[PDB]
Write an enzyme that holds these catalytic residues in place. Structure first.
Site, short mmCIF file in Angstrom:
data_model
loop_
_atom_site.label_atom_id
_atom_site.label_comp_id
_atom_site.label_asym_id
_atom_site.label_seq_id
_atom_site.Cartn_x
_atom_site.Cartn_y
_atom_site.Cartn_z
N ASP A 167 0.84 -1.18 0.00
CA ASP A 167 0.00 0.00 0.00
C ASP A 167 0.88 1.25 0.00
O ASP A 167 1.43 1.65 1.03
CB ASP A 167 -0.95 0.00 1.19
N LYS A 221 2.77 11.33 -3.89
CA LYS A 221 1.59 10.63 -4.39
C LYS A 221 0.61 11.67 -4.95
O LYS A 221 -0.12 11.39 -5.90
CB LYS A 221 0.93 9.78 -3.29
N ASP A 267 -13.04 5.24 3.69
CA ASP A 267 -11.63 5.40 4.02
C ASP A 267 -11.25 6.74 4.69
O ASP A 267 -10.92 7.71 4.01
CB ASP A 267 -10.80 5.15 2.75
N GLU A 301 -7.65 1.03 -4.00
CA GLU A 301 -7.63 0.97 -2.56
C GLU A 301 -8.96 0.43 -2.06
O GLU A 301 -8.97 -0.54 -1.30
CB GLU A 301 -7.18 2.30 -1.97
MG MG Z 1 -4.45 7.92 0.87
#
Ligand code: MG
Ligand code: ADP
Ligand code: ADP
Ligand code: BEF
Ligand code: CL
Ligand code: CL
Ligand code: CL
Ligand code: MG
Lengths: 540, 649
Positions: A8, A69, A197, A173
């Site tokens: 991840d 990211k 999330d 994800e």
């Molecule tokens: Mg994230």
């Protein structure tokens, strides 16, 4: 030698799991940490990845890169990259259309692409995997958010290969997490599932549709800058109120004292998900003064009433965009550590009307879990350790006071057993099922656990009627004993009100032995009677 | 149907594991950490147990007790008490038993608690930690201890478990629990018929260094040699540094920090933190606010300097590795791999200093924080009456020779070596004694000069009762079953008389068929159990009386905590109800409550509001639901005419 890890790659911390022994193991780094920070920090001597890097931030802020990211596979003049260039105390140049970060590695200038920063993070995650696993690691499944586009989704698979990984597959994800809880393995129909999330600083609702374990990504809602760190802030603010008041001094200018009050609030926050009170006690906060106070959970939930409740919003905007009603979501899944906030769950569960939330798996690392399961499946999967079993033979009483066993001691649990019995006298109306536990052949030396009656058997001759007892134990060890009349279909059962608490393996072993010391006269007692059949509610 | 719980009772922090869903998981606690701090501390209204205790470390410094596991069975006058109290913070005092204990200001008063009773306190907390995470029932526990623990302390820490209401299925040597971890997971160990894999395990934790070498094969480990330095762990590094800075702040500051408890302590804690940091970086800033006389301190340390500081420690490292191979009668190249576990094996100089002690690379394939605990819970599962575990056989080392003695009645000898030095355990030995009657037996060390200074020599003694002679016999053979158990503990497991009898059996001769006749029978003597005898054990374990005593105090102390927390729950249900009520008079009940009805509360919330600011900031459970009552009276009513009016309407 060469196994399949799942990674991840998250915005601020990456996790790495491996599937070995029926379950996923999440690997720790050579500092004890399961998650590793997504930081690379360049300096003179050498570079620094993970904790090493994040430790020496604030002594290299203009050279410790992070959030790569947030711009992997994108254009310099991008809608969102424009807003972003703001905080990052490091330089973000342009090399013909695309973003590129720029640094002091070895004193002067060099500049690396996002995919390069992200790739030297995976390298450490690779390394971390390799340490634990013994052999070397090449195949990986790397994850990305559902809302990624093919270009950033690609640059991610580049980071991978630039890092020497053979990126078997890139996956969502949200879908990684649904994987972990193995909904893509639940009985037919089409399944609607909502991932929820809540990180420490990103929020992400996603709705997936699964038929035959194929992942259809219905809709994504969210909030770019919402999580943990925010609820912390409320507390910090709130406590500077309190300190400034109770002490006339205001700390707000103190880059250390504010930090220490922060650390403390995060700890308290975590405390408040388990307890209803928490406590803050920083020895010598400001000007030698001591701050010792408490905070209640209701007071905590209050400072964030606006923030919590507001997590329900991307839910409605995802429920809508995906053309679905709140009652058409079959499974909900908490992911990220902020989802541990009782109130946030309390809000989410009620919104969906008492429905249960999938959260067994540490949310901190549910995603990495799912990815590590995949890299398994995608590599051929790369006895049983523990088995639940029964402590004592279970059975019913038969004509004589005999014990007729239905389930032998030490039977592997989830079990179902059925034996046909008959009637003892003629024109017998009904039978009395008495359930016994014990290893003796005479129910008088065993333990009664419960009793019920099957009544209204068609009167018939002693020996004809087909009564059909079944013992059922579910995974939990709950025991249903049920008699059914083959003839009529008339049926009665009982769910034994358990009692477990308890007998320890010694006890059993001493019970087992008593029954071995009497085998002779126990056996020669039901070896003089002859018939396996129940009597008309004639107990004893 | 209750869960196996293995506990790794490390000096700094414990790791709770449970066996469940056909595997072994770790349990996270209330603050979501994967290890509770092994601290017991005492308030003025409750106890601060585990995670909380650590917070208070600085406020409650005087009524905070850590080092739980090292004061167990510690003789108050022990020639080394020094080395233990060195690390303490609350005052230690001698007890009736000459053993160590703690004085703490608690529930107003002075209290004195024994290490057994203190350790029972922590174990209860974590038992609860696990109870809540399992939602299930918790009885059996397997606990992990340093291999150095004495047969006494093994008993004590077990009796601890009993006070906190768990039944100790086994006291296990920790690094051996890591060995079981290793053995039951790793996937192509040698076949039983092949040469085994020799793996050395090195665990430097917070206070103890241990190195033991084991031989593995599928389903099997045998421990070949174990050697410990019980005064070598993270805490010794924490001082090493703390002492370096203490010198500096004597110089470029002139405060002798070694003058203040609160001061020395905050530098310590900060030394620890810095150290962890230099395990990952080459340089590290160091700063503490207001150490003494409103002074701020600021310095730093480089890895090179860190290491330069600890050369003393770096030189006591190979000692136990040599002692281990020496005992395991092995040479270093016969060891296939060397796995490090334990917090302070994370320091790179130490990593190397051990690599060159074995002369091969380190391996790190166990979860080096959860292996002792995870394996420990497997073991617990072994003893679960409701589980069938993967078969796995493990024998630990039984370092000291132990003999057993007995009333020399009709017997030539009155004793014999029973479990030799270097044998494995558990081990059962059957003996047969000839008995003129009831008798007494005792177990002890064959050569007391082999054991650490001031080890008693007497280990336990039993009395056997109910011996009864056949009839015309002057003596009787009783078979005893002496047993060194899986916890290492020397017991007598069972004793019974035997007697011969004649069982007439027929003689065959089905060769001939002599008109069918001449059936012969032979008297045959068959030896048979006669009577089962009664064993009273006298061990370091505590008696049923003193046990229930210690247990009823933990029962009270525990239920005074459970009220102290059950109270602040209502203080919150109230407070929460207050907020959520005003916040719905507007968001839902405006259209649904009357108008004159709104100034009825509003309103009444407001007294009940500032209520929570003096009477009471901390009231009594009675009043926190008291106010909640009459506030809820006006709730429901409104709340309902709303719910049944929109639900269907
Ligand atoms: Mg994230
Ligand atoms: N028990 C808990 N209660 C409330 N918040 C928690 C808890 N545990 C962790 N958190 C919060 O979750 C955040 C991080 O969780 P995670 O999902 O791993 O995202 P990140 O990648 O930012 O770590 C932290 O800010 C932390 O405060
Ligand atoms: N990354 C690290 N570098 C150096 N030392 C560490 C690191 N992490 C933990 N430690 C030290 O190791 C000790 C804790 O290790 P652990 O084996 O859990 O102790 P115990 O098992 O005795 O409770 C602490 O004193 C801590 O300071
Ligand atoms: F429990 Be530790 F490993 F000493
Ligand atoms: Cl469905
Ligand atoms: Cl805010
Ligand atoms: Cl959790
Ligand atoms: Mg230790």
């Amino acid at each position: 030698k060469g196994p399949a890890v799942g990674i991840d790659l998250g915005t601020t911390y990456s996790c790495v799991g491996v599937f070995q022994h029926g379950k996923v193991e999440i690997i720790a780094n050579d500092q004890g940490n399961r998650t590793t920070p997504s930081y690379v920090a360049f300096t003179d001597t050498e570079r620094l990845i993970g904790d090493a890097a994040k430790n020496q931030v604030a002594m290299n802020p203009t050279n410790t890169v992070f959030d790569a990211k947030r711009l992997i596979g994108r254009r310099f003049d991008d809608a969102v990259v424009q807003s972003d260039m703001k905080h990052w105390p490091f330089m973000v140049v342009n090399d013909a259309g695309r973003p590129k970060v720029q640094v002091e590695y070895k004193g002067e200038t060099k500049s690396f692409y996002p995919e390069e920063v992200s790739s030297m993070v995976l390298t450490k995650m690779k390394e971390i995997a390799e340490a634990y696993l013994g052999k070397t690691v090449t195949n990986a499944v790397v994850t990305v958010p559902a809302y990624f586009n093919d270009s950033q989704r690609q640059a991610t698979k580049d980071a991978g290969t630039i890092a020497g990984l053979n990126v078997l597959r890139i996956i969502n994800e949200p879908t990684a997490a649904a994987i972990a809880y193995g909904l893509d393995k639940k009985v037919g129909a089409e399944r609607n599932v909502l991932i929820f999330d809540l990180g420490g600083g990103t929020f992400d609702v996603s709705i997936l549709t699964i038929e035959d374990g194929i992942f259809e990504v219905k809709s994504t809602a969210g909030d770019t800058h919402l999580g943990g760190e925010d609820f912390d802030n409320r507390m910090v603010n709130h406590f500077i109120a309190e300190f400034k008041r109770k002490h006339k001094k205001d700390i707000s200018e103190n880059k250390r004292a504010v930090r220490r009050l922060r650390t403390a609030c995060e700890r308290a926050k975590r405390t408040l998900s388990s307890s209803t009170q928490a406590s803050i006690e920083i020895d010598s906060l400001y000007e030698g003064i001591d701050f010792y106070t408490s905070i209640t959970r209701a007071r905590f939930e209050e400072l964030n009433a606006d923030l919590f409740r507001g997590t329900l919003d991307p839910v409605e905007k995802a429920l809508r965009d995906a053309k679905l009603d709140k009652s058409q979501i079959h499974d909900i899944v908490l992911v990220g550590g902020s989802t541990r906030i009782p109130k946030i769950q309390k809000l989410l569960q009620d919104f969906f009307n008492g429905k249960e939330l999938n959260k067994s798996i540490n949310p901190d690392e549910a995603v990495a879990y799912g990815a590590a399961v995949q890299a398994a499946i995608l590599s051929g999967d790369k006895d049983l350790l523990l088995l639940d079993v029964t402590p004592l033979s279970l059975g019913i009483e038969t004509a004589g006071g005999v014990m007729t066993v239905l389930i032998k001691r030490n039977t592997t649990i989830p079990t179902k057993q059925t034996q046909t019995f008959t009637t003892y006298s003629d024109n017998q109306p009904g039978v009395l099922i008495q359930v016994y536990e014990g290893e003796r052949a005479m129910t008088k030396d065993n333990n009664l656990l419960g009793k019920f009656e099957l009544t209204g058997i068609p009167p018939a001759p002693r020996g004809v009627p087909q009564i059909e007892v079944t013992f059922d134990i579910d995974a939990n060890g709950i025991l249903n004993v049920s008699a059914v009349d083959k003839s009529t279909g008339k049926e009665n059962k009982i769910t034994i009100t358990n009692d477990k608490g308890r007998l320890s393996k010694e006890d059993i072993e001493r019970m087992v032995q008593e029954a071995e010391k009497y085998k002779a006269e126990d056996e020669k007692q039901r070896d003089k009677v002859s018939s396996k059949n129940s009597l008309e509610s004639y107990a004893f | 149907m209750s869960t196996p719980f293995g506990l790794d009772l490390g000096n700094n922090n414990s790791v709770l594991a449970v066996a469940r869903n056909r595997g072994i998981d770790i349990v996270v606690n209330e603050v979501s950490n994967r290890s509770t701090p092994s601290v017991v501390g005492f308030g003025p209204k409750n106890r601060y147990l585990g995670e909380t205790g650590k917070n208070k470390q600085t406020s409650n410094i005087k009524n905070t007790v850590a080092n739980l596991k090292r004061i167990i069975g510690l003789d108050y006058h022990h020639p080394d008490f020094e080395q233990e109290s060195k690390h303490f913070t609350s005052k230690l005092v001698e007890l009736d038993d000459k053993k160590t204990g703690a004085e703490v200001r608690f529930a107003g008063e002075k209290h004195v608690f024994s290490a057994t009773q203190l350790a029972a306190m922590f174990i209860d907390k974590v038992k609860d930690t696990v109870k809540q995470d399992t939602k299930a029932n918790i009885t059996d526990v397997c606990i992990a201890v340093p291999p150095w623990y004495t047969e006494e302390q093994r008993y004590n820490i077990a009796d601890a478990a009993r006070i906190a209401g768990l039944n100790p299925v086994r006291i296990v040597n920790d690094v051996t629990a890591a060995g079981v971890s290793y053995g039951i997971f790793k996937t192509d160990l040698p076949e039983g018929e092949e040469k085994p894999r020799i793996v050395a395990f090195v665990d430097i934790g917070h206070s103890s260094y241990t190195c033991s070498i084991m031989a593995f094969k599928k389903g099997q480990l045998k421990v070949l040699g174990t050697a410990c330095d019980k005064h070598f762990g993270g805490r010794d590094f924490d001082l090493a540094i703390t002492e370096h800075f203490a010198d500096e702040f004597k110089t470029k500051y002139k405060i002798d920090i070694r003058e203040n408890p609160k001061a020395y302590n905050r530098i310590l804690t900060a030394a620890e933190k810095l150290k962890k940091v230099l395990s990952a970086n080459t340089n590290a800033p160091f700063s503490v606010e207001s150490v003494m006389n409103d002074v701020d301190v600021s310095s730093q340390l480089s890895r090179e300097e860190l290491e330069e500081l600890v050369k003393p420690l770096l030189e006591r490292v190979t000692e136990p590795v040599t002692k281990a191979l020496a005992q395991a009668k092995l040479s270093a190249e016969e060891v296939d791999f060397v796995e490090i576990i334990g917090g302070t094996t994370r320091i790179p100089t130490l990593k190397q200093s051990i690599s060159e002690a074995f002369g091969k690379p380190l391996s790190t394939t166990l979860n080096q924080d959860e292996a002792i605990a995870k394996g420990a819970a497997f073991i617990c599962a072994i003893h679960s009456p409701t589980l069938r575990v993967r078969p796995f056989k493990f024998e630990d080392i039984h370092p000291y020779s132990v003999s057993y003695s007995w009333d020399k009645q009709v017997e030539d000898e009155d004793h014999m070596e029973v479990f030799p030095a270097g044998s494995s355990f558990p081990s059962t030995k059957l003996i047969t004694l000839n008995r003129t009657g009831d008798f007494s037996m005792a177990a002890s060390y064959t050569d007391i000069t082999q054991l650490p200074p001031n080890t008693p020599e007497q280990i336990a003694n039993w009395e056997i009762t109910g011996v009864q002679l056949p009839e015309g016999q002057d003596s009787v053979p009783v078979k005893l079953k002496l047993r060194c158990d899986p916890s290492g503990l020397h017991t007598i497991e069972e004793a019974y008389t035997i007697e011969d009898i004649e069982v007439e059996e027929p003689i065959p001769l089905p060769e001939d068929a002599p008109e069918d006749a001449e059936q012969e029978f032979k008297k045959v003597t068959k030896t048979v159990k006669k009577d089962d005898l009664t064993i009273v054990a006298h061990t370091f374990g505590l008696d049923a009386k003193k046990l229930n005593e210690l247990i009823e105090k933990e029962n009270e102390m525990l239920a005074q905590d459970k009220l102290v927390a059950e109270t602040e729950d209502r203080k919150n249900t109230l407070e929460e109800y207050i907020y959520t009520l005003r916040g719905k008079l507007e968001e839902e009940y405006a259209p649904f409550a009357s108008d004159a009805e709104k100034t009825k509360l509003q309103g009444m919330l407001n007294k009940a509001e500032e209520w929570l600011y003096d009477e009471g900031f901390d009231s009594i459970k009675a009043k926190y639901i008291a106010k909640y009552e009459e506030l809820a009276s006006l709730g429901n009513i409104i709340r309902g005419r709303y719910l049944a009016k929109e639900e269907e309407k």
